[PDB]
């Protein structure tokens, strides 16, 4: 699946890094249309994986709080580390992953099937 933007007009890996610095973690259109974050590696580049913002607790779209280096849900205080792995509940699971491949911009999101590297446990979002 392809990842559109705010006005729903796809993301150009280049266009995105012109405004989005490094270590960036802002939202966009993701798989199933859900809000999926987009990370910018320390090497001011697109990360291979995308994080689905939907809090695994009760549903709130979780925000990135770079001040504490982690995603913190405003609803009941769920905390996911910079990698998306649930570190604080009541959320029981981590922010679903998704592959983020580039193709000369032309950024698209891919469904994740292999084991969740963040916990070695196989994905639940499958």
């Amino acid at each position: 699946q392809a990842a559109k933007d705010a006005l729903g007009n796809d993301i150009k890996a280049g266009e995105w890094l012109k405004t989005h610095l490094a270590g960036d973690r802002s939202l966009s259109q993701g798989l199933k249309g859900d809000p999926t974050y987009l990370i910018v590696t320390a090497d001011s580049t697109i990360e291979k994986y995308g994080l689905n913002a939907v809090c695994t607790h009760l549903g709130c779209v979780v925000p990135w709080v770079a001040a504490e280096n982690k995603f913190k849900c405003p609803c009941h205080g769920s905390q996911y580390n910079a990698e998306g792995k649930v570190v604080r509940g009541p959320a029981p699971l981590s922010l679903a992953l998704a592959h983020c491949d580039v193709a000369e911009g032309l950024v698209t999101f891919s469904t994740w099937t292999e084991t969740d590297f963040r916990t070695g446990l196989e994905p639940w979002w499958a």
Binding site: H57, L58, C75, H76, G77, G89, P90, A91, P92
Partner: peptide, 14 residues
Amino acid sequence: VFQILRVVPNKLLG
């Protein structure tokens, strides 16, 4: 109830 939820660990027990 809200408080119970945010203050309790399990998502079910809550």
